[PDB]
């Protein structure tokens, strides 16, 4: 239909478009590299290649697909690997025995031929149906019940509903009548990669994410269907925190969409998806591959794919949230995504605003990060899901005033700022307890009250102790520990106890692999109770003794409790919640006995 005029890397001009649609996908050249329009100039158009562009020719045909970028939504997406162009990588590797990905390969996102069982939800002929009505369910695998739903822009009366049976994707199962037309339907539905899926209503979040890490779960809680921000450091986080979301998270599904990353890390993690099963179900061991989907685009991938992959991932997440399942989206991108925006702006010759980043970076980041929340779905029956976003930014070593970082912290409510010093200190969680913050605190008030009313005050006390330690660290560095008082001494002891027992979670050991909230709250309660008892003891300071003398005494006389407070970390959660609660209650009772007999002896 049209022919190329100008080729410069990802940018390819195609004269002869005349009537063409903004962001309409167009195939370029004999190999048919799929690309989207970015800049109309008249009859001419500008197309990002989305592939390797070497070897084009002037007058090579360019065809219009007339449709914007879309990803095939349907049964069979779970446990699959897709590029930003929604290409099943394992399917490509199997169909074509060559280890490479051939240039301009055209493979359907989901195999039509593959069979799947069906289960209508007592649907009757002639019933009026609306978009998003969960008329039937399909078990893609154990513990995964894909409830097929009507497309959002679809409604009518059910003239025909298929009986339950084995069907391929190309097969039609549902027929609707509306306004005197008949509309057939297959399981697979297409949805634009932009323009988020419609939502009946947005709801205020109520439940925390309850991640394995202690600091993430207590100091900086995050609600279900809420934004997150991590600096994407190595060693931990994108390896540790990500593993915690993958197997230790209460989210039903994980959509890992890493883009612009180290290739070997994704090779390893893809080798890890089939393995590393988690026995979350009572009677079965849920292999994480069932509850994950990898959108993998390594650094060698084309630049436009770096922009496309994020929207593909968020579209998949919105799809899953439509069924009511709570799904988490971890994104190792948005670090290199800004670089991709810089590149496309530079080729398009747009004028950058700050440090070479195009201005609409902030707007696009705001859109993507606001595409997540707790949502009441469309159709019947009434159901509710959520999407939780965890997106990386520049590594913590660089300045946190970087435009991408500044844009993210504007909209993101929870920043889990990792510390380079902590990483060098080999402190594995590496979460800084000063820069990090979770604005979601006020919402979780009811949850914390119903769980444990005393938790709020002890958390505030722990925060105050940490702040005091950080504040007077400068003083003790300058002046010295000689002037430190008994209150300062117990404050430093409690701060060290926190830094060692509480904020540190190795996660490579069964006792530290996962820390349930009940164990975390008890450990914090024990630490705060010990701090309070020490405060009261040094405050009493009577009987020709006490204060710093009392502090030294309780350091030596009550050294056993202080030592086993550290071992409280080693208490194995697998032993069972009632046993751990009993053990911690006994420890608390002994701590109360401590500083009470020490009170009786009056030093």
């Amino acid at each position: 239909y049209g022919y190329v005029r100008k080729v410069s890397g990802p940018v390819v001009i195609a004269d002869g478009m005349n009537g063409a649609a903004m962001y309409e996908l167009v195939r370029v050249g004999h190999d048919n590299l799929i690309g989207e329009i970015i800049r109309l100039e008249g009859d001419s158009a500008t197309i990002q290649v989305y592939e390797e562009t070497a070897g084009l020719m002037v007058n090579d045909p360019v065809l219009r697909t007339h449709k914007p970028l879309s990803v095939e939504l349907g049964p069979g997406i779970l446990g699959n690997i897709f590029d930003g162009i929604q290409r099943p990588l394992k399917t490509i590797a199997i169909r074509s025995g060559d280890v490479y990905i051939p240039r301009g390969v055209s493979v359907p996102a989901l195999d039509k031929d593959t069979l799947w069982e069906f289960q209508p939800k007592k649907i009757g002929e002639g019933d009026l149906l609306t978009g998003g009505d969960l008329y039937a369910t399909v078990f893609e695998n154990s513990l995964m019940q894909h409830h097929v739903a009507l497309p959002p822009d679809a409604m009518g009366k059910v003239t025909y509903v298929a009986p339950a049976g084995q069907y391929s994707l190309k097969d039609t199962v549902l027929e609707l009548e509306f306004q005197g037309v008949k509309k057939s339907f297959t399981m697979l539905q297409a949805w634009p990669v932009r323009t988020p899926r419609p939502v009946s209503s947005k709801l205020a979040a109520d439940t925390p994410l309850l991640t394995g890490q202690r600091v993430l779960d207590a100091l900086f809680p995050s609600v279900l269907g809420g934004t997150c921000a991590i600096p994407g450091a190595f060693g931990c986080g994108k390896t540790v925190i990500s593993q915690a979301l993958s197997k230790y998270s209460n989210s039903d599904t994980v959509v890992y969409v890493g883009c612009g990353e180290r290739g070997n890390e994704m090779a390893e993690v893809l080798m890890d998806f089939p393995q590393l099963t988690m026995t979350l179900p009572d009677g079965r061991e849920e292999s994480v591959m069932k509850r994950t989907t990898l959108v993998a685009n390594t650094s060698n991938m084309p630049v436009a794919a770096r922009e496309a992959s994020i929207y593909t991932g968020i579209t998949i997440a919105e799809y899953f949230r439509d069924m009511g399942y709570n799904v988490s989206m971890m994104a190792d991108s948005t670090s290199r995504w800004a670089e991709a925006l810089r590149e496309i702006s530079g080729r398009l010759a747009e004028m950058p605003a700050d440090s070479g980043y195009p201005a609409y970076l902030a707007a696009r980041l705001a859109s993507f990060y606001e595409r997540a929340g707790k949502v009441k779905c469309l159709g019947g029956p009434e159901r509710t899901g959520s999407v939780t976003i965890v997106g990386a930014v520049s590594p913590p070593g660089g300045d946190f005033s970087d435009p991408v970082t500044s844009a993210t912290l504007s909209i993101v409510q929870v920043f889990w700022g990792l510390d380079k010093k902590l990483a060098q200190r080999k402190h594995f969680p590496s979460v800084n307890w000063l820069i990090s913050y979770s604005k979601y605190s006020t919402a979780l008030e009811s949850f914390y009250e119903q769980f444990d009313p005393d938790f709020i005050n002890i958390r505030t006390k722990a925060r105050e102790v940490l702040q005091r330690e950080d504040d007077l660290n400068e003083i003790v560095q300058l002046v010295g520990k000689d002037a430190l008082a008994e209150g300062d001494k117990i404050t430093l002891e409690t701060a060290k106890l926190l830094r060692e027992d509480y904020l540190a979670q190795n996660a490579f050991t069964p006792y530290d692999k996962f820390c349930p909230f009940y164990k975390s709250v008890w450990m914090m309660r024990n630490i705060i109770h010990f701090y309070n008892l020490a405060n009261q003891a040094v405050e009493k300071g009577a009987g020709m003794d006490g204060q710093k003398i009392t502090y030294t005494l309780i350091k030596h006389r009550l050294g056993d409790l202080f030592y086993r407070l550290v071992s409280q970390k080693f208490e194995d959660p697998a032993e069972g919640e009632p046993a751990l609660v009993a053990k911690f209650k006994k420890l608390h009772e002994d701590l109360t006995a401590g500083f009470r007999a020490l009170e009786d002896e009056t030093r």
Binding site: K6, A54, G55, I92, V99, T239, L270, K426, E500
Partner: protein, 467 residues
Amino acid sequence: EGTLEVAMEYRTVTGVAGPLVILDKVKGPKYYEIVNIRLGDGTMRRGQVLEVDGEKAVVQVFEGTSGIDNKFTTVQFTGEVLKTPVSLDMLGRIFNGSGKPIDNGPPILPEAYLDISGSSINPSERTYPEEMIQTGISTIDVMNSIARGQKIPLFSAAGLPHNEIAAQICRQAGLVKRLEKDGEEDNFAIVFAAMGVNMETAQFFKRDFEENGSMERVTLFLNLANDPTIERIITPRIALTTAEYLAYECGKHVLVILTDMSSYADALREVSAAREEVPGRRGYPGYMYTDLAQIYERAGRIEGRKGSITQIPILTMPNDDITHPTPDLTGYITEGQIYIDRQLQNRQIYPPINVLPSLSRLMKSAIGEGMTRRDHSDVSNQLYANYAIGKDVQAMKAVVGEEALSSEDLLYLEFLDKFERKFVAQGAYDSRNIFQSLDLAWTLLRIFPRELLHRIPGKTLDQYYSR
């Protein structure tokens, strides 16, 4: 392959500026079409088509633009991208920047032609770094170890012996599994690519590899500083293609040494300025990250073949910094970083590796029961903790005074001194085993008391504290 076509030959050179020549009235110009330039004097230069638009076509020239004129410059369009010849016979030879042999021998009789920037590997078919190798350097081997298929860049500045340590690593490259490892397939088949290096460094590397006895194994691609700049942007790509063939289609473990990535960034900046695009950070081209990603992501193990590629790209910090775009992007991409510190050089330690910023993201997978002792990770964690606490203690002692320092403070200072003296320092022609090296690390650790070794678990403490 029914019938072929002879390449066109144009004389329409409407503009020659910088390293670029602007052709016109050309028909059917491919992108990245490789052109041969016949000057009026008859000498032949080869170049590439950087951009295609209408009948115009911007052509970059590899060998410079010091003889082109409108009247007599003739240019041909071969209608294909660069495809360097490759074969097993390419081993044990030295080549110019463009791949033209300079070993006074004959040109390569190709086994096949491979398009540069080879086909992308399906990510679902790559594999994690499986085995680990002994690098000889104590600092490299004991901490932030290098596994097969890893991407460990050495970070150095002007004057620091990055070339010397690169040569050392090449001679000391070896397997480590249970200290067991003819091994012709296991032979590392080092591919060395030097870009914009002083002639002295070139002769140094040449003599070092000639005397090493691996002249039948290594392969050198040189692009000296006096050589044309444009040639340098292809040399690492040629090296990557040769490594990919000799590794994947030939079943040999291959190690890659890229030299002076800053020089490559310089060529990229020169090309961008000549083409007059919008800059990035510090005037660099905005797509430099994509170029570095493509130049780095071409290494790693592959499921379908027995080969593997492990690359060690030495990088020159321009002003001895990291915020510079090139080291920053390299850190963004590469899964490791080894630092050579000017402070260490000031005290005259031949390996100046600063262990504190050094890190390997795949070090945990690299170390294993077969690879090392089970307590190797504990040793590394303890060494990190001790070094960090010792640096903080040294600062505290400096600010408060030497006498005011506590006993543990002087212990940490003594640990720092002994570590930086015995451990980091190593000989120039001397390699070393891993297991007794870990024993010496335990000696440095047991200098500290058992109680202070909180980072090490008690089990490994009982295992290897006394010894």
